[PDB]
Amino acid sequence: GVKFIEMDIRDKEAYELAKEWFDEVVVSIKFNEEVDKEKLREARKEYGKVAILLSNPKPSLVRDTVQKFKSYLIYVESNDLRVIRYSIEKGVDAIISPWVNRKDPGIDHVLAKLMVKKNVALGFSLRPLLYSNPYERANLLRFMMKAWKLVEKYKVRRFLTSSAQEKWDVRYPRDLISLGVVIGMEIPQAKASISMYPEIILKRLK
Amino acid sequence: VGGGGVKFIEMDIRDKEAYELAKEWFDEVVVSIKFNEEVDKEKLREARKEYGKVAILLSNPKPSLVRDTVQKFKSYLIYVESNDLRVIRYSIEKGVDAIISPWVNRKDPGIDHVLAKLMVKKNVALGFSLRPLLYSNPYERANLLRFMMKAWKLVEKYKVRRFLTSSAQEKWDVRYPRDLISLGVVIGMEIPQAKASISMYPEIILKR
Amino acid sequence: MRKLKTLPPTLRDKNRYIAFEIISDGDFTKDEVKELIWKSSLEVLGETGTAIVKPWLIKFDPNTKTGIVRSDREYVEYLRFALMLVSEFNGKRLIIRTLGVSGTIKRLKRKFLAKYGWK
Amino acid sequence: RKLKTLPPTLRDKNRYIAFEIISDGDFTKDEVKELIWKSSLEVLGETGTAIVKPWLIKFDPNTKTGIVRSDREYVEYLRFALMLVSEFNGKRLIIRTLGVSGTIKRLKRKFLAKYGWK
Ligand SMILES: CCCCCCCCO[C@@H]1O[C@H](CO)[C@@H](O)[C@H](O)[C@H]1O
Ligand SMILES: CCCCCCCCO[C@@H]1O[C@H](CO)[C@@H](O)[C@H](O)[C@H]1O
């Protein structure tokens, strides 16, 4: 009966709220330099579905992570094309909001093509839009609009997420949908971005 | 800018300098003389010789003042500025030449479908002014745009004669023809219709 | 005075109604909700977009923090977007959540707000 | 480093607008970029500005003329936003659009050459 999934919740309280609105919630555990095996281990126990979130990692950390942690969903968020491309080539499960901190979508037709080939999804996050000024919001939306176009054209896996860092960042599924609509998606497409597609991405962890 | 393209007319300029500027961008300019007590037959007659095409502008007039003007000055264009439906109604019935932005200082388009047909029956036109929009704060501008959008729908449906104008009261209020046209587009007009509101329709109004 | 007359069933504005709930620690008054909705619309949709979407608060119940906001029939997702981007008002953090949408106020109440004691 | 120009079918479809600023005061390129973004944001909102994609290509303080890009389908909305500007940094001004073209080259040749452009 239509299951909705939040692919990127990064906070305890947020998780509690998300679980009340989404059938499934993936908790992303952020890491900068090293992947705390202990922390990550305890995370899976408390939540169940956990993703390793590499925040602007260096290629080595990416290769190393996908090398001995493939069993865990792997997310990469960075504003560096080099890392973005490499992360996609390495086969991470998703690239999250590459446009953040860039003056472009952080993706083109070449990278989009590479993502569909390497089974890598693009994550459209709401959070950057919540606390940014008017100028920033306008640009973020412009880039997200272009990213959507590329994703649609090349059939790249995609999902809408709050990428919540606090309970206050979380939004109801049908509201998250409106974000998709505003950036160019049809209602059916936005719905799939928080149900059908999340399902496909999580498939691998079978 | 004065012959090659379409003849553009500014039906509502209310300032000397505005006029001078408008005369550089519009082929023809109509200067409105504002009267809110009596129609100074003097300044009105002299102003008509300094600008050429002139019109009497009555702001928040008394039904009585309107009746007197529509008669004594059947040779002048009479414009009415009121946020009073009663005064707006009467002005339409008396055959005045146009009602200017009835939505100003109101909480509705200042015109419904019945007045829209009454205007068409009395040949009264509807003027859409840019000025109120210029000086309004965000909240005010949003409301004005909503009212104007509705006004346009009524006018387009019932084929009421209409025109866009700067209703300039100062040099700085005037806008180039093609730019003024965007106001019409934004409120609902197709480019071809917006252009018509500052050329074809003004003609008809001046036809008399 | 003599207010204008309704308007033909083809020119009349077409509307949809949104039922919403405000999640927060602090309370809000009907006026604050009217103000925060206008504020977000003006920022997110601009003066022009606000004139197109025509956001209009029908009613807000301070007790349950639920309410009804109207929008042009064809731009409901844009109003839902403006509401979603709200994070705080008058120093109070909040989350606006849309409960449902309907063509009429009566239907909206029946399926989404009766539960909150609207009736 | 550097994304690749998207295929003609996916690339943005733009229109370039030549304009002139009428005023007693002077304006720098920075002031013009700011007033355009300020007006777009106020008039069109964050969402509308994202759709219109206004972008100052170049401004010439000497002749007070410049080029501003816009999404092809929404030129009239930027034109409107520009028209609602009346004062910036304490200086009254009127923006006048001179013309439009699908390319910068053609825009200049047609409306800015007379101002000494290129
Ligand atoms: C700033 C963002 C602007 C987005 C453009 C929205 C256009 C939808 O708006 C509609 O456009 C129609 C024209 O086809 C007009 O006739 C309608 O009156 C108008 O409401
Ligand atoms: C802030 C003002 C917003 C006004 C609403 C503009 C809606 C136009 O928006 C456009 O609608 C098209 C559907 O025909 C979609 O295919 C486009 O992706 C979308 O950008």
XYZ file of C-alpha atoms and ligand atoms in Angstrom:
691
model
C 0.000 0.000 0.000
C 2.368 2.695 -1.299
C 5.365 2.811 1.039
C 7.134 6.150 1.503
C 10.809 6.305 2.343
C 13.052 9.032 3.776
C 16.507 8.207 2.371
C 18.468 10.760 4.375
C 17.756 11.603 8.035
C 20.799 12.710 10.023
C 19.472 13.220 13.543
C 17.979 11.183 16.396
C 14.956 13.411 17.049
C 14.519 13.895 13.309
C 14.447 10.104 12.960
C 11.650 9.844 15.540
C 9.574 12.386 13.641
C 10.404 10.911 10.243
C 9.337 7.443 11.417
C 5.892 8.832 12.190
C 5.451 10.027 8.594
C 7.559 7.668 6.469
C 7.252 3.879 6.372
C 11.032 3.530 6.157
C 13.793 5.899 7.216
C 17.494 5.701 6.433
C 19.762 7.335 8.998
C 22.869 8.857 7.461
C 25.966 8.824 9.671
C 28.333 11.592 8.575
C 32.118 11.182 8.435
C 34.888 13.544 7.353
C 38.243 11.757 7.638
C 37.619 8.218 8.919
C 34.660 5.857 9.211
C 34.248 5.140 12.929
C 33.583 1.401 12.691
C 32.316 1.399 16.285
C 29.966 4.343 15.810
C 28.683 2.946 12.512
C 28.191 -0.470 14.103
C 26.088 0.860 16.985
C 24.081 2.980 14.546
C 22.765 -0.025 12.628
C 21.602 -1.554 15.906
C 19.621 1.478 17.100
C 18.049 2.354 13.732
C 18.485 -0.651 11.462
C 18.880 1.019 8.077
C 21.962 3.221 8.125
C 23.969 4.915 5.394
C 27.593 6.026 5.514
C 27.733 9.703 4.605
C 31.066 10.972 3.336
C 31.121 14.773 3.594
C 33.538 16.268 1.066
C 35.823 13.228 1.314
C 39.155 12.787 -0.429
C 39.263 10.071 -3.135
C 41.206 7.724 -0.832
C 38.489 7.751 1.829
C 35.925 7.047 -0.894
C 37.812 4.124 -2.421
C 38.593 2.800 1.057
C 34.966 3.123 2.162
C 33.463 1.398 -0.878
C 36.206 -1.208 -0.505
C 35.482 -2.511 3.005
C 31.963 -1.162 3.624
C 29.987 -2.008 0.481
C 27.540 -3.789 2.801
C 26.468 -0.320 3.971
C 24.665 2.240 1.830
C 27.247 4.825 0.836
C 26.391 8.503 0.334
C 28.718 11.227 -0.878
C 28.137 14.943 -0.531
C 30.734 17.335 -1.933
C 31.070 20.352 -4.196
C 34.181 19.016 -5.973
C 33.695 17.655 -9.503
C 36.730 15.395 -9.152
C 35.352 13.720 -6.024
C 31.875 13.670 -7.545
C 33.027 11.851 -10.680
C 35.317 9.509 -8.745
C 32.567 8.697 -6.241
C 30.269 7.804 -9.130
C 32.968 5.699 -10.795
C 33.554 3.963 -7.451
C 29.872 3.044 -7.401
C 28.565 4.786 -4.271
C 24.797 4.524 -3.864
C 24.126 8.232 -4.144
C 25.481 11.720 -4.701
C 23.599 14.227 -2.534
C 22.898 17.812 -3.607
C 26.159 18.427 -5.569
C 24.891 21.931 -6.375
C 25.337 23.071 -2.783
C 28.257 25.524 -2.661
C 28.692 25.485 -6.440
C 27.660 27.935 -9.156
C 26.213 25.099 -11.241
C 24.110 21.922 -10.849
C 27.274 19.947 -10.102
C 26.176 17.536 -12.811
C 25.986 17.425 -16.624
C 24.874 15.002 -19.336
C 28.206 13.174 -19.157
C 28.042 12.623 -15.390
C 24.310 11.809 -15.577
C 25.101 9.125 -18.155
C 27.847 7.778 -15.889
C 25.405 7.646 -12.959
C 22.875 5.500 -14.820
C 25.687 3.171 -15.872
C 27.231 2.863 -12.396
C 23.796 2.634 -10.715
C 24.268 5.852 -8.747
C 21.292 7.937 -7.602
C 21.016 11.702 -7.242
C 19.592 13.078 -4.010
C 17.573 16.302 -4.009
C 17.658 17.738 -0.509
C 15.293 20.282 0.988
C 17.481 21.515 3.844
C 19.726 23.887 1.849
C 16.531 25.691 0.849
C 15.207 26.064 4.406
C 17.807 28.344 5.975
C 19.364 30.121 2.985
C 18.832 33.757 1.976
C 16.648 34.772 -1.033
C 19.553 34.942 -3.506
C 20.846 31.525 -2.440
C 17.384 29.950 -2.588
C 16.806 31.238 -6.113
C 20.110 29.812 -7.344
C 19.640 26.506 -5.497
C 16.246 26.140 -7.170
C 17.671 26.985 -10.597
C 20.354 24.299 -10.265
C 17.903 21.734 -8.880
C 15.646 22.453 -11.848
C 18.483 21.735 -14.291
C 19.569 18.643 -12.350
C 16.021 17.300 -12.524
C 15.971 17.801 -16.302
C 19.185 15.799 -16.697
C 17.984 13.087 -14.331
C 14.676 12.781 -16.193
C 16.274 12.679 -19.645
C 18.838 9.984 -18.794
C 16.653 8.058 -16.314
C 19.086 8.470 -13.415
C 17.754 7.145 -10.081
C 16.563 10.013 -7.894
C 14.918 10.785 -4.552
C 13.616 13.755 -2.592
C 14.816 14.083 1.000
C 14.765 16.551 3.883
C 18.388 15.669 4.736
C 17.194 16.743 8.192
C 19.727 17.649 10.869
C 16.946 18.436 13.378
C 13.323 17.399 13.863
C 12.468 20.888 12.578
C 13.969 20.000 9.162
C 11.597 17.111 8.536
C 8.592 17.408 6.233
C 5.515 15.272 5.518
C 5.802 13.031 2.407
C 3.122 14.807 0.367
C 4.733 18.164 1.160
C 8.197 16.945 0.168
C 6.433 16.036 -3.106
C 5.615 19.708 -3.792
C 9.354 20.429 -3.850
C 9.678 17.934 -6.680
C 6.753 19.562 -8.472
C 8.228 23.053 -8.140
C 11.533 21.935 -9.646
C 9.819 20.339 -12.659
C 8.517 16.889 -11.708
C 4.972 15.732 -12.386
C 3.125 14.631 -9.246
C 3.555 10.927 -10.211
C 7.295 11.430 -10.734
C 7.749 13.169 -7.380
C 5.826 10.400 -5.614
C 8.101 7.780 -7.171
C 11.078 9.797 -5.942
C 10.066 8.974 -2.365
C 8.774 5.435 -2.871
C 9.597 3.469 -6.042
C 13.125 4.860 -6.465
C 14.146 4.577 -2.810
C 13.011 0.955 -3.063
C 15.257 0.294 -6.077
C 18.281 1.913 -4.449
C 17.831 -0.138 -1.260
C 17.459 -3.294 -3.377
C 21.234 -3.797 -3.510
C 21.405 -4.264 0.268
C 19.270 -7.359 -0.369
C 10.132 55.890 -32.330
C 7.875 58.152 -34.375
C 6.475 56.576 -37.530
C 8.155 53.327 -38.545
C 6.356 51.104 -36.069
C 2.866 51.315 -34.582
C 1.495 54.640 -33.342
C 1.677 54.475 -29.546
C -0.470 56.770 -27.442
C -0.183 57.702 -23.763
C -3.733 58.456 -22.615
C -2.793 59.594 -19.127
C 0.156 61.905 -18.430
C -0.359 64.333 -15.538
C 2.837 66.377 -15.492
C 4.665 68.844 -17.710
C 8.054 67.136 -17.614
C 6.395 63.725 -17.806
C 4.759 64.961 -21.016
C 8.070 66.124 -22.484
C 9.540 62.692 -21.799
C 6.444 60.827 -22.961
C 6.464 62.865 -26.200
C 9.856 61.342 -26.953
C 8.611 57.769 -26.648
C 4.955 57.937 -27.657
C 3.684 59.296 -30.974
C 0.778 60.976 -29.205
C 0.296 62.025 -25.575
C -2.898 62.980 -23.714
C -2.369 65.186 -20.661
C -4.971 64.918 -17.888
C -5.969 67.966 -15.838
C -7.020 66.970 -12.313
C -10.126 68.669 -10.896
C -11.694 67.755 -7.547
C -13.984 70.753 -6.952
C -14.887 72.540 -10.200
C -13.693 72.424 -13.793
C -11.515 75.536 -14.108
C -12.633 76.447 -17.632
C -9.502 78.617 -17.817
C -6.500 76.427 -17.018
C -8.379 73.658 -18.813
C -8.582 75.774 -21.962
C -5.002 77.067 -21.765
C -3.562 73.658 -20.912
C -5.312 72.419 -24.039
C -3.269 74.884 -26.089
C 0.071 74.073 -24.451
C -0.103 70.291 -24.812
C -2.688 69.830 -27.537
C -4.649 66.720 -26.615
C -5.978 67.224 -23.084
C -8.576 65.559 -20.862
C -10.448 66.453 -17.681
C -9.567 64.164 -14.781
C -12.056 64.074 -11.918
C -10.811 62.445 -8.707
C -13.392 61.324 -6.141
C -15.972 63.615 -7.819
C -19.474 64.265 -6.527
C -22.199 62.775 -8.747
C -23.248 66.395 -9.303
C -19.805 67.506 -10.495
C -19.825 64.679 -13.041
C -23.207 65.599 -14.524
C -22.119 69.220 -14.924
C -18.891 68.243 -16.702
C -20.313 65.671 -19.122
C -22.455 68.483 -20.523
C -20.530 71.756 -20.402
C -17.468 70.017 -21.860
C -18.739 67.592 -24.499
C -15.615 68.467 -26.503
C -13.149 67.280 -23.851
C -12.227 63.754 -22.778
C -13.515 63.131 -19.261
C -11.682 60.699 -16.971
C -12.930 59.539 -13.581
C -10.873 58.451 -10.576
C -12.983 56.944 -7.818
C -12.861 54.078 -5.342
C -16.578 54.626 -4.801
C -18.778 52.149 -6.689
C -21.665 54.600 -6.454
C -19.590 57.341 -8.083
C -18.134 54.748 -10.465
C -21.626 53.558 -11.384
C -22.956 57.049 -12.060
C -19.876 58.080 -14.040
C -20.429 55.081 -16.320
C -24.103 55.914 -16.806
C -23.273 59.534 -17.684
C -21.132 58.440 -20.626
C -17.722 59.625 -19.387
C -14.757 58.576 -21.539
C -12.984 56.363 -19.010
C -12.675 55.045 -15.480
C -9.066 55.026 -14.257
C -7.881 52.190 -12.013
C -11.054 51.871 -9.902
C -9.214 49.275 -7.778
C -6.972 51.889 -6.152
C -7.961 52.276 -2.500
C -10.381 49.344 -2.693
C -10.237 45.648 -1.837
C -11.652 44.412 -5.136
C -11.183 45.081 -8.878
C -13.548 48.009 -8.394
C -15.543 46.485 -11.233
C -17.726 43.399 -11.682
C -19.397 41.776 -14.693
C -22.471 44.017 -14.594
C -20.481 47.275 -14.609
C -18.283 45.690 -17.258
C -21.286 45.377 -19.565
C -22.634 48.789 -18.535
C -19.301 50.307 -19.586
C -19.579 48.592 -22.963
C -23.119 49.943 -23.307
C -22.130 53.526 -22.460
C -18.874 53.176 -24.416
C -16.843 53.911 -21.253
C -13.252 52.620 -21.232
C -11.099 51.157 -18.447
C -7.645 52.533 -17.719
C -4.901 50.370 -16.178
C -2.329 52.579 -14.420
C 1.274 51.580 -13.739
C 1.866 54.269 -11.107
C -0.023 52.702 -8.181
C 2.215 49.643 -8.645
C 5.446 51.621 -8.642
C 5.113 53.195 -5.194
C 3.371 50.288 -3.440
C 5.013 48.033 -0.867
C 5.157 44.228 -1.559
C 1.794 43.448 0.045
C 0.091 46.336 -1.764
C 1.626 45.413 -5.146
C 0.467 41.798 -4.845
C -3.107 42.948 -4.144
C -3.045 45.461 -6.994
C -1.799 42.834 -9.441
C -4.533 40.414 -8.378
C -7.253 43.041 -8.835
C -5.838 44.132 -12.197
C -5.642 40.501 -13.369
C -9.348 40.080 -12.610
C -10.179 43.459 -14.167
C -8.435 42.299 -17.335
C -10.488 39.100 -17.467
C -13.768 41.030 -17.234
C -12.575 43.573 -19.807
C -11.314 40.969 -22.287
C -14.478 38.865 -22.026
C -17.030 41.654 -22.349
C -14.789 43.376 -24.894
C -14.583 46.563 -22.816
C -12.311 49.185 -24.358
C -9.110 49.366 -22.316
C -5.648 50.924 -22.292
C -2.426 50.787 -20.272
C -0.950 54.060 -19.014
C 1.753 55.338 -16.689
C -0.601 57.935 -15.219
C 2.732 59.696 -14.679
C 2.771 62.568 -12.190
C 6.499 63.001 -12.575
C 9.163 62.491 -15.227
C 10.345 59.375 -13.400
C 6.926 57.676 -13.692
C 7.017 57.424 -17.487
C 7.927 54.158 -19.220
C 8.888 53.232 -22.800
C 6.066 51.642 -24.899
C 7.499 48.136 -25.143
C 8.201 48.077 -21.390
C 4.762 49.411 -20.424
C 3.449 46.526 -22.516
C 4.935 43.970 -20.069
C 2.470 45.214 -17.455
C -0.367 44.065 -19.685
C 1.311 40.739 -20.382
C 1.964 40.064 -16.701
C -1.669 40.695 -15.777
C -2.940 38.354 -18.501
C -2.701 40.046 -21.911
C -1.053 38.402 -24.893
C 1.662 40.637 -26.344
C -0.572 41.569 -29.326
C -3.373 42.637 -26.960
C -1.047 44.634 -24.703
C 0.196 46.578 -27.740
C -3.399 47.208 -28.783
C -4.119 48.739 -25.374
C -1.651 51.543 -26.115
C -2.482 52.172 -29.779
C -5.687 50.757 -31.269
C -7.928 51.274 -28.252
C -6.665 54.781 -27.491
C -7.625 55.614 -31.099
C -11.238 54.559 -30.553
C -11.396 56.627 -27.374
C -10.096 59.649 -29.299
C -12.324 58.769 -32.280
C -14.969 61.125 -30.892
C -22.386 49.850 0.226
C -23.290 48.012 -2.980
C -20.525 45.423 -3.248
C -19.849 44.024 -6.722
C -21.804 40.989 -7.938
C -20.278 37.493 -7.747
C -19.172 36.632 -11.305
C -20.104 34.171 -14.101
C -19.175 30.491 -13.442
C -16.376 30.845 -16.006
C -14.717 34.082 -14.891
C -15.158 33.498 -11.148
C -11.884 32.499 -9.467
C -11.467 28.721 -9.213
C -10.229 27.615 -5.798
C -8.909 24.652 -3.861
C -8.619 24.460 -0.114
C -5.694 23.184 1.894
C -6.079 21.795 5.399
C -2.911 22.193 7.453
C -1.468 21.713 10.920
C 1.311 23.669 12.597
C 3.755 21.636 14.659
C 5.490 23.752 17.269
C 6.267 24.283 20.936
C 4.982 27.849 20.970
C 1.391 28.899 20.315
C 0.260 31.027 17.385
C -2.691 33.382 16.999
C -4.932 33.598 13.933
C -3.222 36.879 12.998
C 0.304 35.461 13.205
C -0.687 32.620 10.871
C -2.238 35.064 8.403
C 0.959 37.110 8.548
C 3.460 34.245 8.202
C 1.566 32.857 5.189
C 1.586 36.250 3.404
C 5.273 36.653 4.311
C 6.379 33.314 2.937
C 4.302 33.777 -0.207
C 5.827 37.179 -0.943
C 9.365 35.839 -0.485
C 8.966 32.472 -2.208
C 6.455 33.408 -4.920
C 7.100 37.146 -5.088
C 4.536 39.865 -5.612
C 3.587 38.419 -9.004
C 3.453 34.795 -7.906
C 1.413 35.832 -4.881
C -1.135 37.548 -7.163
C -1.335 34.350 -9.243
C -1.557 31.821 -6.386
C -3.799 34.090 -4.293
C -3.033 32.564 -0.843
C -5.935 33.266 1.543
C -6.325 32.067 5.124
C -9.931 30.931 5.614
C -9.619 29.984 9.279
C -7.098 28.967 11.907
C -7.923 27.140 15.151
C -5.352 28.113 17.803
C -6.403 25.201 20.055
C -5.360 22.368 17.713
C -3.123 24.554 15.546
C -5.001 23.468 12.416
C -6.438 25.643 9.689
C -7.676 26.153 6.161
C -5.858 28.151 3.528
C -7.247 28.802 0.038
C -5.309 29.032 -3.219
C -5.948 29.383 -6.937
C -7.133 25.928 -8.027
C -4.190 25.337 -10.376
C -1.263 26.354 -8.136
C -1.818 24.353 -4.968
C 1.706 22.866 -5.132
C 3.275 26.314 -5.166
C 1.403 27.330 -2.034
C 2.302 23.985 -0.445
C 5.940 24.789 -1.317
C 5.829 28.272 0.246
C 4.283 26.798 3.414
C 6.921 24.042 3.568
C 9.764 26.580 3.464
C 8.537 28.215 6.679
C 10.857 27.415 9.607
C 9.999 30.072 12.196
C 7.885 33.102 13.004
C 8.174 35.601 15.838
C 10.971 33.577 17.422
C 8.986 30.340 17.436
C 10.174 27.393 15.357
C 7.539 25.456 13.481
C 6.712 22.937 10.801
C 3.647 23.391 8.651
C 2.232 20.106 7.444
C -0.478 19.814 4.806
C -3.198 17.321 5.770
C -5.194 17.316 2.541
C -6.749 19.237 -0.347
C -10.311 19.668 -1.600
C -12.476 21.558 -4.042
C -14.744 22.811 -1.239
C -14.474 23.840 2.411
C -17.264 21.458 3.458
C -15.551 18.427 1.904
C -12.142 19.441 3.262
C -13.523 19.675 6.801
C -15.378 16.394 6.586
C -12.372 14.316 5.565
C -9.420 16.112 7.157
C -10.565 18.356 10.011
C -13.612 16.706 11.618
C -10.987 14.634 13.435
C -9.655 17.853 14.956
C -13.146 18.775 16.098
C -13.924 21.278 13.368
C -17.435 20.270 12.315
C 36.852 20.427 -13.360
C 34.290 22.353 -15.418
C 31.060 20.653 -16.509
C 30.457 20.140 -20.230
C 28.041 22.249 -22.261
C 24.768 20.322 -22.239
C 23.289 19.052 -25.532
C 21.266 21.681 -27.458
C 18.078 19.904 -26.353
C 18.907 20.190 -22.651
C 20.741 23.516 -22.566
C 18.919 26.614 -21.315
C 17.041 28.540 -24.024
C 17.905 32.210 -23.558
C 17.040 35.690 -24.786
C 19.349 38.673 -24.365
C 17.906 42.068 -23.523
C 19.676 45.323 -24.363
C 18.755 48.130 -21.992
C 19.585 51.707 -21.113
C 19.408 53.372 -17.709
C 17.984 56.884 -17.653
C 18.999 58.976 -14.624
C 20.931 61.944 -13.289
C 23.207 59.696 -11.268
C 25.894 57.196 -12.281
C 25.906 53.442 -11.710
C 28.654 50.859 -11.463
C 28.357 47.346 -12.870
C 27.988 46.003 -9.302
C 25.073 48.342 -8.556
C 23.278 47.208 -11.714
C 23.703 43.511 -11.012
C 22.318 44.150 -7.527
C 19.250 46.191 -8.488
C 18.313 43.589 -11.115
C 18.524 40.731 -8.610
C 16.764 42.768 -5.938
C 13.842 43.589 -8.219
C 13.584 40.081 -9.632
C 13.519 38.603 -6.136
C 10.835 41.022 -4.943
C 8.635 40.970 -8.044
C 9.144 37.357 -9.149
C 10.118 35.780 -5.828
C 12.777 33.138 -5.281
C 10.818 30.626 -7.343
C 10.150 33.029 -10.213
C 13.736 34.218 -10.255
C 14.802 30.552 -10.514
C 12.520 30.143 -13.538
C 13.428 33.433 -15.240
C 17.146 33.065 -14.544
C 18.046 36.768 -14.815
C 21.728 37.425 -15.431
C 23.623 40.634 -16.125
C 26.034 39.909 -18.978
C 27.614 43.373 -19.161
C 26.974 47.007 -18.251
C 28.675 50.135 -19.546
C 28.852 52.966 -16.973
C 29.889 55.415 -19.705
C 26.721 55.101 -21.791
C 24.586 53.560 -19.031
C 23.688 50.667 -21.341
C 24.009 46.928 -20.813
C 22.918 43.380 -21.591
C 20.859 41.147 -19.293
C 19.983 37.535 -20.099
C 16.677 35.804 -19.357
C 14.976 32.487 -20.037
C 13.511 32.737 -23.538
C 9.942 32.009 -22.414
C 9.893 34.587 -19.612
C 11.437 37.756 -21.064
C 8.252 39.728 -20.333
C 8.465 38.879 -16.647
C 11.991 40.210 -16.330
C 10.961 43.241 -18.394
C 8.212 43.801 -15.828
C 10.581 43.422 -12.871
C 12.969 45.897 -14.513
C 10.135 48.365 -15.123
C 9.185 48.442 -11.446
C 12.615 49.816 -10.485
C 12.482 53.566 -9.804
C 15.328 54.347 -7.417
C 18.502 52.576 -6.286
C 21.045 53.749 -3.740
C 19.231 57.089 -3.537
C 19.261 57.791 -7.274
C 16.045 57.947 -9.327
C 16.225 55.997 -12.562
C 14.202 54.541 -15.410
C 15.246 51.347 -17.118
C 14.387 51.176 -20.805
C 14.756 47.993 -22.803
C 16.174 48.705 -26.257
C 15.519 45.337 -27.847
C 15.918 41.576 -27.674
C 17.925 38.903 -29.469
C 18.757 35.225 -29.185
C 22.467 36.025 -29.182
C 24.803 38.627 -27.685
C 26.525 39.198 -31.033
C 23.247 39.936 -32.820
C 21.988 42.000 -29.876
C 24.984 44.345 -29.989
C 25.064 44.642 -33.773
C 21.400 45.647 -33.670
C 20.964 47.883 -30.607
C 24.273 48.623 -28.909
C 26.558 49.350 -31.860
C 25.210 52.898 -31.871
C 26.551 53.209 -28.321
C 30.034 52.112 -29.363
C 29.814 48.455 -28.326
C 32.343 46.022 -29.820
C 7.548 34.913 -12.081
C 7.069 33.558 -12.536
C 6.062 33.714 -13.636
C 5.553 32.372 -14.119
C 4.536 32.543 -15.233
C 3.167 32.067 -14.800
C 2.147 32.227 -15.891
C 0.811 31.739 -15.395
O -0.023 32.868 -15.114
C -1.104 33.036 -16.047
O -0.597 33.221 -17.439
C -1.649 33.395 -18.453
C -1.017 33.561 -19.848
O -0.977 32.323 -20.567
C -2.513 34.654 -18.082
O -3.556 34.839 -19.048
C -3.113 34.473 -16.666
O -3.896 35.607 -16.314
C -1.950 34.284 -15.645
O -2.452 34.116 -14.320
C 6.599 31.926 -8.354
C 5.531 31.972 -9.417
C 5.253 30.589 -9.932
C 4.182 30.604 -11.007
C 3.895 29.207 -11.535
C 4.679 28.938 -12.799
C 4.415 27.571 -13.357
C 5.240 27.391 -14.598
O 6.275 26.461 -14.302
C 6.509 25.510 -15.340
O 5.284 24.715 -15.634
C 5.452 23.715 -16.697
C 4.129 22.963 -16.929
O 3.406 23.494 -18.044
C 6.590 22.715 -16.281
O 6.783 21.734 -17.307
C 7.902 23.499 -16.028
O 8.944 22.609 -15.646
C 7.653 24.546 -14.903
O 8.835 25.296 -14.627
